[PDB]
Enzyme design. Structure first.
Site, PDB file in Angstrom:
ATOM      1  CG  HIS A  94      -1.956  -1.118   1.151  1.00 16.22           C
ATOM      2  ND1 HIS A  94      -1.719  -2.343   1.734  1.00 16.22           N
ATOM      3  CD2 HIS A  94      -3.167  -1.213   0.551  1.00 16.22           C
ATOM      4  CE1 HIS A  94      -2.740  -3.148   1.495  1.00 16.22           C
ATOM      5  NE2 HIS A  94      -3.632  -2.486   0.779  1.00 16.22           N
ATOM      6  CG  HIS A 134      -7.687   3.588  -3.286  1.00 18.91           C
ATOM      7  ND1 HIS A 134      -6.753   3.778  -4.279  1.00 18.91           N
ATOM      8  CD2 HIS A 134      -7.458   2.352  -2.785  1.00 18.91           C
ATOM      9  CE1 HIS A 134      -5.989   2.702  -4.369  1.00 18.91           C
ATOM     10  NE2 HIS A 134      -6.396   1.823  -3.473  1.00 18.91           N
ATOM     11  NE  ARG A 189       6.504   0.776  -8.119  1.00 14.87           N
ATOM     12  CZ  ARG A 189       7.199   1.745  -8.708  1.00 14.87           C
ATOM     13  NH1 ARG A 189       6.697   2.408  -9.748  1.00 14.87           N
ATOM     14  NH2 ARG A 189       8.404   2.056  -8.256  1.00 14.87           N
ATOM     15  CB  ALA A 219      -3.162 -17.004  -1.867  1.00 14.44           C
TER      16      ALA A 219
END
Ligand SMILES: C[C@H](Cc1nc(=O)c2cnn(-c3ccccc3Cl)c2[nH]1)C(F)(F)F
Ligand SMILES: C[C@H](Cc1nc(=O)c2cnn(-c3ccccc3Cl)c2[nH]1)C(F)(F)F
Ligand SMILES: [Mg+2]
Ligand SMILES: [Mg+2]
Ligand SMILES: [Zn+2]
Ligand SMILES: [Zn+2]
Lengths: 319, 319
Positions: free
Chosen positions: B66, B106, B69, B266
């Site tokens: 986070h 965001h 980029r 995953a």
């Protein structure tokens, strides 16, 4: 100290919330936690309990309406409902603990200017809570920052799982006090009323939202002598706002506008389109609530309507 | 200074984000705002817009995943979609400004530990936001904190009514990136989808919510080595959270446990049950998405399934 008379009256919604000083109110709040069996069932350190109440008080602002006496007012009414509606037969002690603690913390650090001001003024509050019930959110946060200090933490001896449940319940109840959500919530509750289930968790969550909402705007249930001063204290705060609002460009609401609102017309609208309907549906669940609280409400409505004539009559003269 | 070759590959999801540096990406972002004519249709001061994107870049943290980029990818992907799906034929410049600004902001000031950590550890954010989307709420807040300064306020030249509609939109989008609401949002969408209506303001809100959600978790839509590194950066951050949780004695999510998570398994579940289903639905409205985004996602899924077989075999050879 509190006389057995005072402690006795503390169960009725006729209690005169004006006769006391902060210290005497702190004692009443304290009495309530013991008498409800909360100190006992949650192993609340009796010393912490009193220290918490002091920190809560310390964190309420000296506003004309949204102050510690209001806090006590809501908590005391909630207390009355517990005995009046024999709530301890329908609610777990954890539920009562939540109702009482939420009532006591629901307005922590209130600034005197409602959410509408906050959002329109693009305040540091409105920004932080993205215009979503900023005040309510803030009260709730302060409530838990307080409980964060081990010295005021009246929940020390409650296991983490119980704490989680209590925290989530308090947050729901405190956010439910935002009147912007009044219709939404009344609809949800009335919809469940079509067949209420004291065993349906969601049914109970709404009933609890309704109960704290009831207490938070229950001034008109109290005796006319006790009730009136509150309406004036609220309007003071409201004018304090609409003053700052007009001299800042920010719009103003009719019920906060000097040239438009009058104590009488306002309370006639509030009592008929908010208070009586709400306490009406609650009566369908609790019959004793009709005599003890729906009665003064009707009376109150009637009285403000007679006061409306005279007010209008005086208006004709000043013109 | 972007070359013409760059300005062209920047409109496609195949763009290699791993090349450019903070300085260069800031340029691409600036470009996107002019290219989309947001500057034009809104009166954005080209100098302010350049400072703002710098204000923003500063407020992002140095996290393995986070970081600025990620921010770039999300906005770049959003940009790709405005062109691919020709969203300027469906959305107003208002909505396009919201989608792009929302995407850029965001994850402002993300700390590198998700909401579960905040909540379980009872952090300031958790306390402040009452366990309600604490990170996202904070992002959207730091976003408007920056637009608060007079020098980064790229909205300064917009009428009051305009800024209101933008802000509300941005709050909605940013708050919709919280995966905890994924199923809820996907449902509301799949519903309105049974009879979409580019007129219905609610139908459009859900589409904008789904669009930014797509862009926020669209790494696997990109080319295999633009994508792969990202999965690694996310786990580096995750293990960083579980190590701290184990140490502090807080519960650990399985997908963050070194002894349980495998990239293969995953991404298989994530691709089959989260990514593909969401894009398939979006593809109903925009058929051209199937070839440019579903395609690489199906390949990503298969590749990872093939990669898991290898991992099973390889491990069996060792027990
Ligand atoms: C315009 C208000 C109406 C009103 N009457 C009440 O009895 C009452 C009780 N609580 N609140 C209240 C207080 C704060 C926010 C919202 C409400 Cl609802 C009230 N508001 C008054 F004419 F000034 F009274
Ligand atoms: C356990 C994760 C699963 C996963 N895969 C992604 O491609 C992806 C993209 N974004 N996110 C994501 C990031 C942060 C929060 C939520 C999500 Cl959804 C992802 N999470 C990973 F296998 F390690 F990758
Ligand atoms: Mg309040
Ligand atoms: Mg995020
Ligand atoms: Zn209140
Ligand atoms: Zn993100």
């Amino acid at each position: 100290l509190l006389s057995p008379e005072t402690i006795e009256a503390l169960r009725k919604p006729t209690f005169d919330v004006w006769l006391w000083e902060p210290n005497e109110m702190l004692s009443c709040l304290e009495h309530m936690y013991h008498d409800l069996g909360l100190v006992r069932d949650f192993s609340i350190n009796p010393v912490t309990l009193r220290r918490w109440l002091f920190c809560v008080h310390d964190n309420y602002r000296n506003n004309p309406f949204h102050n510690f006496r209001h806090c006590f007012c809501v908590a005391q009414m909630m207390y009355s409902m517990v005995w009046l509606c024999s709530l301890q037969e329908k609610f777990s002690q954890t539920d009562i603990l939540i109702l009482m603690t939420a009532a006591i913390c629901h307005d922590l650090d209130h600034p005197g200017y409602n959410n509408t001001y906050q959002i329109n003024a693009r305040t540091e509050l409105a920004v932080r809570y993205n215009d979503i019930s900023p005040l309510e959110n803030h009260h709730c946060a302060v409530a838990f920052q307080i409980l964060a200090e081990p010295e005021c933490n009246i929940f020390s001896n409650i296991p983490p799982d119980g704490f989680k449940q209590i925290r989530q319940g308090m947050i729901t109840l405190i956010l439910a006090t935002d009147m912007a959500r009044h219709a939404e919530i009344m609809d949800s509750f009335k919809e469940k009323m079509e067949n209420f289930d004291y065993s349906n968790e969601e049914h109970m969550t709404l009933l609890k939202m309704i109960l704290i909402k009831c207490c938070d705007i229950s001034n008109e249930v109290r005796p006319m002598e006790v009730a009136e001063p509150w309406v004036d204290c609220l309007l003071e705060e409201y004018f304090m706002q609409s003053d700052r609002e007009k001299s800042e460009g920010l719009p103003v609401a009719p019920f906060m506008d000097r040239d438009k609102v009058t104590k009488a017309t306002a309370q006639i609208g509030f009592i008929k389109f908010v208070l009586i309907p709400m306490f009406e549906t609650v009566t369908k669940l609790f019959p004793m609530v009709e005599e003890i609280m729906l009665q003064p409400l009707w009376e109150s409505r009637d009285r403000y309507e007679e006061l409306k004539r005279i007010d209008d009559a005086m208006k004709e003269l000043q013109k």
